[PDB]
Amino acid sequence: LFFLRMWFLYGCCLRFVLFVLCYYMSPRLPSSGNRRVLYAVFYLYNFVWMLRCFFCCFIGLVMSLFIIEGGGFVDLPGVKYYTRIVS
Amino acid sequence: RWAAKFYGQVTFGPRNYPYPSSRWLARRFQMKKHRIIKRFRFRRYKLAAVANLPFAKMIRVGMLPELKSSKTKRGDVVDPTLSGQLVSAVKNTGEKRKGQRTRPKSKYQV
Amino acid sequence: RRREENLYTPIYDFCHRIREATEQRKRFVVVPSTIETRGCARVMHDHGLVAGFRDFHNDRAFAVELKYFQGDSTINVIEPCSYDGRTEFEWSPKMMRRLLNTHGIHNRLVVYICRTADNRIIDHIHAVKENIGGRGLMMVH
């Protein structure tokens, strides 16, 4: 188990975040493609943290806040958090 | 010695490996050590430890406003008397006085 | 030789002498002579784990004669109870009674040696008999 990947869950299983950016990043070879990465924000003890996580979710009509869960590893190095649903 | 012999763990091989380090690993870490040392030389690092001061905390003299290499970065704040004395030390270290013991010289020491 | 190292005991290296001399198939071992050490020898010789033993009233050492059967030793394993002298394990009578019991069947196969408040060196079987607790020394079988 790798315990430092969970740094921004802060001892919680799931997180609530707000959408900011959505950009694309290329995974580690030999896997080619475009991985969609959402750049999100949330606040804890009046500090505003920018969270960076893998967008696997389904976007419908335009919506703002997501639910973040931690997984195993993914093709893309450096992105620990995954998306459950969008609200 | 003050400085570090190694950087990172240079002896990592399997147990009972009958040498301190393998060739491969030692070459990797020789690379990293090389880069760090080269950085020290070109940026012209200088450290000092003064008597009757906390020793673990070393005044970095290479960042002092007079001896600073960069024209841009704000260097450091060290006492006026002490800093004068440090400048004098660095300056009068440079050249060999006869009767004194010969000590290794370099471009980057100035 | 230094601080982190274990503090050895005549029992510790008594057991390891015997173990190593059993691995090299020797007939005789010269071994440290203290009260509980030659106690341990008399108990092992009772159970027949050892061919014989003698104390010559030599101060340092005395001698043990090992027994082999069917080409390997009579001793599977022999282990000291404590690694240090700074650690002392006490055996409750119920514990020594647990050892004797293999899921409902009475098992005397393995022997455990221990000190008593009475300075006797006993196996766990006599200990359980008279219901006295004792300090652990070593196991052997």
Place this chain on the structure above:
Amino acid sequence: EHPAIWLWYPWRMNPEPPTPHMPQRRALKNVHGAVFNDLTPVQKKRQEQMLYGVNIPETRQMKFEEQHPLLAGALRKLEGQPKGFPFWYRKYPTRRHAYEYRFSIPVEMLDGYNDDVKKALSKGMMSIQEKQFAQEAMYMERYAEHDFDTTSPAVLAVKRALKCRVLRNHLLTNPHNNIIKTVLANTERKLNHALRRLRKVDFKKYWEIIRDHDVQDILQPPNLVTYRQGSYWKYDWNAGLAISTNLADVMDPRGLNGCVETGRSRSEVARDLGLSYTRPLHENEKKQLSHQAVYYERLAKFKMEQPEAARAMERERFVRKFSGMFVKMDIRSGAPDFPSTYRRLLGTKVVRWASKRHGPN
């Protein structure tokens, strides 16, 4: 000019030497870190007295004559004549006992030989090592409990004292052999052991050894930390000499013990038996006590002769008792350590104290 400066170019393994430069020759420490520049005049005297020569004390001739008057009678008949039978053998019980000539050759054995031979076995002809062994044997003999005693504390302490002086002046001459620095330090440690066992065996001999060879510097407790925890005094516990005193010759034991049933201390039963044990006092304790003894006479004189001043002070005290922090004694007020038992007040509410601990506890 002002503190030394080490300059370190971090690509280099070690710093450049300091600017004031230090002394060119390293100081020689004793075991505890104290510095000796040279032998002390006493030790110097010991080596100057070893060098030119030693001597057997006529003490030995005397006790030889009183113990074995017959043998001494024989030697007394035979002086100057060559002897084929060594009557003198009782005078020299051990090989080591005869140091006045080389190779442990007793004096009276040289009677019938050439004077050249006599000069060739003389003290002047000894090597330096032989001379050391000579001094050591003489002193060992003066402190020994019997002839063959070696391991006893006094003997050990003396021989180690001598060895130590030798090594010290040796290091004075040729500065770097760190083998012998180490051997000097180890010797000094074993000397420390020997002396601290001595003062609990017989202390006067301990004293006169320290006064003869001038080693008080290795009896000094190393540092305040381990001393404050009483591990300096803890040594003679480990050595097993802690209870060894055998009081009755000194210190009549009647007032050293407390009463179990009464609960009264030793100062109390001493009070009752009309005995006084008190350590000799320095001027501190004397002038403190002599200042305190007189409080009531000074007071009586004050309140007789000068009532108004007194009544002023009293006004202030009496009225003070009503002002102030606490007017009545409760567990809170009567807490002997206020900052300690309430630490939770110290930053915020209570500003008087800046720390929670002013004493052991």
Place this chain on the structure above:
Amino acid sequence: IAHWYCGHKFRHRFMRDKRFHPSLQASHDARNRFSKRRHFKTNRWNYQQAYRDMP
């Protein structure tokens, strides 16, 4: 070993446990266990004449 105590690695836990180990405790022989090196070579150039009030 709970992962929140001490460092993020495991071995940091056992490195701080060696601070509490029974046979490792500080005494008159083993001293300054936690910083040995700040106090090293501290008195080298401090010259102290040892204390003798007896000849």
Place this chain on the structure above:
Amino acid sequence: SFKYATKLQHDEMRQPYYIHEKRYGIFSNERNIAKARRGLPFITPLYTKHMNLWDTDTDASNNRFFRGYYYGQRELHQLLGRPHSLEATNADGSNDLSTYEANTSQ
């Protein structure tokens, strides 16, 4: 030896209450229960330790915790001046009597 014996909430796993009486006298706690500051957090300490383990009364002969060598008894023998060792003849730490104990009838 199991988990059920870990739970002291059974009265069968727990040293009984009355011991604290036997040490401090009977009905001694009824006093303590009426105390001003109680149970927040602390109550007047309740001493229950199996009476064969009591440090006060018992000694090296009936109590196994006293005859532990390397800290209690080692110091004691060093102090009293008995010869001692790791594995010794006497139950406690000691090969033989000291000089005082041999020369004096107590």
Place this chain on the structure above:
Amino acid sequence: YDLTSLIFNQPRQGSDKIGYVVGTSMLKTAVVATNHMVYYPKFNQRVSRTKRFFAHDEDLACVEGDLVHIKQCRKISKYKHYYVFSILEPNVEGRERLKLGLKAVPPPLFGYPVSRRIVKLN
């Protein structure tokens, strides 16, 4: 269970202590270093720790380096709950050392450790 409870029957834990006298700078006050015991059940072994106490000796017998018996008592001053019950071993060497006008024990050579480098020459 340690030396102290081995020798004494204590009405209350810590009511008796045996220790050494370390320093007397305070009138009618003897500081005493004492050992007590800690048990680590994980490793099944004991450690000795040490602690200082202020003890009250009226009449000022105690010389530094005495082996003393010490008891719990009435609160005396802010930090003194203990009094010197009996001198087990007096310091004969120290007393004779005082009689000659010298300090009981030589003062420790170095004080507490520092993080500086003191350059003090001659």
Place this chain on the structure above:
Amino acid sequence: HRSGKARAFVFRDPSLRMMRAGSGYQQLRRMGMPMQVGMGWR
């Protein structure tokens, strides 16, 4: 693996594992060693 945990050559005799546990914390709680200075369970 110079950098990593020490492994036993064989297992440990379970019986010995149980014999060394005699003075452990649970047995102590059962003997009553620790003082009860607080309310504890309700």
Place this chain on the structure above:
Amino acid sequence: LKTLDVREYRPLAMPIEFRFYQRYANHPNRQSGIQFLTHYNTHQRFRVNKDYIDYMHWGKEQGQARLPHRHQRVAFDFNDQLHPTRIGYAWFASQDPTFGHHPDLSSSFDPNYRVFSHPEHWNKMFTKRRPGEGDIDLSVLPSRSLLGPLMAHSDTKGIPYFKVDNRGHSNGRVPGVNAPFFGEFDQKMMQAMSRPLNANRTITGNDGRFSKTIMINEPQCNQALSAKTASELSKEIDKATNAVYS
């Protein structure tokens, strides 16, 4: 460093030293192993600072160069002889007249005997190892020079004639060495470790699997049995004889 492997390299070799490091040591200066059966102050042979061994010139007669020399061994084999008892034949007069020198009585046997080891005694490390070089202590090998016997040669006869020494054999009267020897030789140790079958240690015994040895021990009165000792023997004899496995 680069956090991944740039090279895909799988060696298939599994050297037994790499895997089980509990039982094998590849570090130089640790090669002498774990031997408990030595007489030294450590069970780890390679921390011992006394006798440094010589891997090149040693171990002709003992097998490996690690193992203890023939004369220092504290553990003995079944079919191998154990140490000779030193003397320092007159005392066999009661025995077989032809019986020669007993194999276990030796004139010169030294349990403390320094064997010459090069790395200790001849140490070439501080030199270039040219033919004469290296530092040598001569205190090990007995001097084969003629200087000694010449320099000390005297008209007074030697120590033995002068009978300077006190004591004698350290055990006092010994049947083999000092006094005469009567009865029978036990060459195997069979009578020397036996268990007293009696409270009086009068009768002793040695039991094999299927065999039983009862030995009467009363060397003082010439094996004359008392009433108690005889009534005892009639017990040990029939309790040995009515045993199941004898």
Place this chain on the structure above:
RNA sequence: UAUACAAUUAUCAUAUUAAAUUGUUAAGUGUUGAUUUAACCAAUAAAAAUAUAAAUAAUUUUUAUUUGUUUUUAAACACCAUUAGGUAUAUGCAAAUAUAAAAUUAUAGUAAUUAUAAAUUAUAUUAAAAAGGUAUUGUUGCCCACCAAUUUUUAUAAUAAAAAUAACGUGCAGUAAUUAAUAUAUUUAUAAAAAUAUAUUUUUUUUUUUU
């Protein structure tokens, strides 16, 4: 998210029972000139040899002491630079592999691991016979640093550090690999790295029991 190292043998930086320290010797002129080197250039050339015994074992030196950096060239070799020189080897300072440790990296938050050794690889003068692989249908094999973008953590040193990374441009550092490599030391620098001083084989071996 909690949920059981070893204690018989484990290679990088926390030493510890030890006998050393000190020695004033050698070498130098006849004469007309191609020595050394794979090749250049400066330009007198000969040389510095001796010590064993003895020192007792353990228990409170850890702020103490200690691990190849050293005055004098009017003395050389050697090394570094180049016809104009520098330097030329333990009196200052300098703890430090000989192992007490808990998966790799990383200043202790970065990536998800890393490291490793015996299979396989055609030419070394026997009356043809001994050999290495970071590759893995294997040299047209792999890999190494600087040089752009970006991503991310922070203890911001010419131009911060570290980690992900798949461009462009230099080369050719490494796999006994085109002057063998590895570690420490000191110097040098487009970049791998290179020169020298010590140790050393995870480099391949060449072998006089008085001639």
Place this chain on the structure above:
RNA sequence: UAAAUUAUGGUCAAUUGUUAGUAUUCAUAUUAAUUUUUUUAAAUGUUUUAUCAUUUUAUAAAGGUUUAUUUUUGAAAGAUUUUUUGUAUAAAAUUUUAGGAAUAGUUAAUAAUAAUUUAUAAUUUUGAUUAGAUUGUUUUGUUAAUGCUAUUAGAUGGGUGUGGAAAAAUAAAAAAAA
């Protein structure tokens, strides 16, 4: 330095992951939890009394404390016709931070002293004081097991000092003088 029997006694220790050359407690298992669900809580007006008063009705606000928290019967219980006693405030142990330095209305003696009594004072490297985190010494989970891993909550200075005891300014679920 001998064996043992008047025979199973003194009441149960028992370990379950389909891996990927090898070295090292580390992904995917079970149990326990958070994810996860309205079958146990609850509303305001306390109450007498001799009248502007006087009797009864004593530890859930916050702050962040690791050498730390300690106490009586004079209230009630409580029984006689009246003067009734003594015992108490003190201590000992256990005390956290990867890379570590000084702390301070300050110690001890005097005494119902001293904002300037006397003294060679006290705490600290056997780890202090500040500073971070944190509600302290019968409570849990896992486990065959010395372990590892939890345990809430409740005592936050004085300033007409009432009261037996400060625990005294919403937040019960304590029958509070028919």
